[PDB]
Amino acid sequence: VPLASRAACEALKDGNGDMVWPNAATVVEVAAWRDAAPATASAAALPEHCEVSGAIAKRTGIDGYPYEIKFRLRMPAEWNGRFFMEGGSGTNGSLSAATGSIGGGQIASALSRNFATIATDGGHDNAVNDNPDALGTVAFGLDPQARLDMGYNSYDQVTQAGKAAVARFYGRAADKSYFIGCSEGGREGMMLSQRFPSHYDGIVAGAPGYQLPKAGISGAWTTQSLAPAAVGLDAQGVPLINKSFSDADLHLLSQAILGTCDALDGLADGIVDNYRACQAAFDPATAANPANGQALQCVGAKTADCLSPVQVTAIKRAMAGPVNSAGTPLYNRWAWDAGMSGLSGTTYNQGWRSWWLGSFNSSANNAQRVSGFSARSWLVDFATPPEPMPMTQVAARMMKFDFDIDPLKIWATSGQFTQSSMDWHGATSTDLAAFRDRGGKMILYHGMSDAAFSALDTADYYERLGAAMPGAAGFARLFLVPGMNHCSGGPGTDRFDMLTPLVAWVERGEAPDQISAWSGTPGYFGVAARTRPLCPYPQIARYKGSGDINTEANFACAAPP
Ligand SMILES: [Ca+2]
């Protein structure tokens, strides 16, 4: 059977065929030859390739549901010798097209660049592991092994199955392996560098949820912090956290942040490049509304041009981060940034507020962290033992969350839950020497206006890494994105090709001194286009003093003033 052919492809199915899978419980459902597909308005052309899909470790969980680790692999006929895995998102449970997303709002897929590409659902399936008594598609959390699969094991099993298929199909191993993930996918990339250092040579970890079990602790905190500013009750009698601030209120706050913080980088441009000086300077309880030259905080009754003392107290407490009775921090604080709002044409940015507040225009709580996926995930996936409950109870549970008792549950084991959610899901280790010392390179990125995971918390991980590993910028660099929301969106340069510079760093030792980025919504600044350099932490973009402020070539990376 010739290598890299339709016959080699279809032979991967038989199971009586020659093919030897590292995991004996690997079942191939599909091995099909796929014709080249043209470019579309939204996707780069795909080459001719072999598509393999199936499942590892089919079983029944202790909840009585089916579990397996699905994968989908695409091996181009004409291969550049590179292997590529994409990361997940949310609580996973779906199996993408597996053409290899590189994020950063890119048109090009890794498969369109002649990589072999793989993806997984992470060990459960949203169509089948949907349990109306354990909050829907988070129900995989009732099964101890489904937790370990979600945390680390699925990515490991699928990486090995993929490299074995590559070696059989092409008759050689990949020259280099690359992983790109954002959010849950960025947690996965950091987990790979820590737990499986030789799985990937290059890793991009965007907005990484490396402490994801603490997300719901932040959520209980932001929920209780904002409840005083809430107006009205939902059907269960929970305050409408979504009514704490209107879109106009959040735009006023972002304008005040720009009034204090915009020019701290040397240029007034609707972007806070000097995020550190901003956190030192801005306090909404003393700052000016620069529209009217008066205090942001209302002196009399609430108007459109001010925030009430209760709103200011609420947002300051939410942003400060959760503490227990002892005043011990349980997560981290969040950065004040312009991307908490923004206006493009007639449209207010929803990309910050959807996490802690939800939609203003609603009679129900719909924030991720109040009643949505993130609050549900905490209760069933990260709390040990799990706390399944009707969906109508979730917001009340966040309101009565106890910061001395509930936070212990991400460190506990219980009955058949023999690892804590910090053990299986967390990726807090700074022991990266095995990764670095085999030639591994890691690009981290994070939007400053991310309300899922704190940019400042990624920066603190990076600080702890630099302290544990002198010269860390030789193998790992962090790119903070002023104005960007969770993975994409918001008034910043949220679009970039991370794969090109990753390949250059891994294969040529060329470290990214900067990464070109451009705004997906340049409407936020009223321009056609804005391109800026992303800078390796702790550097920021500095205007050179002349030229179009919308052109990258007029900016350099430097220490803050
Ligand atoms: Ca600026």
Whether residue 377 contacts residue 368, with contact meaning beta carbons closer than 8 Å, is answered with no
Give whole-number Cα distances, 69 to 248, 377, 542, in Å. 45, 19, 47
According to the annotation, is 247 in a ligand binding site? no
Answer whether 252's CB lies under 8 Å from 222's CB.
no
Residues 6 or more apart in contact with residue 60 via CB below 8 angstroms:
66, 67
CA 90 – ligand 1 centroid, Å = 32
Neighbours of ion ligand 1 (CB under 5 A): 262, 265, 267, 269, 271
| 374 is an annotated ligand-binding site residue | yes
Q: Is 271 annotated as a binding residue?
A: yes
For residue 349, count CB atoms less than 10 angstroms from its CB and return exposed for 0-12, middle for 13-18, buried for 19 or more: buried
From ligand 1's centre to the CA of 536, what distance in Å? 17
Burial of 355 (0-12, 13-18, 19+ CB in 10 A): buried
Pairing assessment for the beta strands 441-447 and 476-481 based on DSSP bridges: parallel
* Residues contacting 300, CB < 8 A, separation 6+: none
From the centroid of its chain, how far is CA 399?
A: 25
The amino acid sitting at 541 is A
- Separation of CA 482 and ligand 1 centre (Å): 9
183 is catalytic: yes
Based on the number of CB atoms within 10 Å of its own CB, is 192 exposed (0-12), middle (13-18) or buried (19 or more)? Answer: buried
Residue 350's nearest CA partner among 465, 487, 485 is 485
What is the CB neighbour count within 10 angstroms for residue 403? Answer: 17
d(CA 116, CA 129): 29
Catalytic residue among 450, 457, 488, 494: 450
For this entry, resolution in Å reads 2.1
In the chain, the N- to C-terminal Cα span, in Å, equals 64
Distance CA 208, CA 198 (A): 20
**Is 267 assigned a ligand-binding role in the annotation?**
yes
Residue 387 CA neighbour count, 13 Å, CB half = 17
CA distance 76 to 216: 41
Give residue 30 CA to ligand 1 midpoint distance, Å. 52
Report H helices in 171-308.
184-195, 215-226, 247-261, 275-281
Is 177 assigned a catalytic role?
no
Task: Using CA atoms of 10, 13, 16, 17 in order, give the dihedral in degrees to the nearest 10.
Answer: 40
Beta bridge partners of 297: 307
Compute the distance from residue 331 Cα to the ligand 1 centre, in Å. Answer: 28
Which strands, in side-by-side order, build the sheet including 66-76?
A: 26-34, 49-60, 66-76, 116-120, 82-86, 176-182, 202-206, 441-447, 476-481
As a whole number of angstroms, the distance between CA 418 and CA 416 comes to 6
Q: What is the distance in A from the centroid of ligand 1 to the CA of 539?
A: 14
Largest CA distance in the chain: 82
Q: Letter for the amino acid at 547?
A: G
Tell me the CA–centroid distance for residue 542 and ligand 1, in Å: 9
Residue position matching structure tokens 């899909």: 53
**486 a known binding residue?**
yes
Side-chain-side CA neighbours of residue 208 (13 Å): 32
Could you confirm whether 486 is annotated as catalytic? yes
Q: Please name the residue ranges forming H helices in 358-454.
A: 373-377, 394-399, 421-424, 433-437
369: exposed, middle or buried (C-beta count within 10 Å: 0-12, 13-18, 19+)?
Answer: buried
Using a 10 angstrom Cβ sphere, with 0-12 exposed, 13-18 middle and 19 or more buried, the burial of residue 235 is: exposed
Query: By what method was this entry solved?
Result: X-ray
Element (H, E) at 354: helix 353-356
Catalytic position from the list 199, 251, 425, 486? 486
Select which of 89, 109, 154, 183 is catalytic.
183
Q: How many separate helices (H) and strands (E) can be counted in the chain?
A: 15, 15
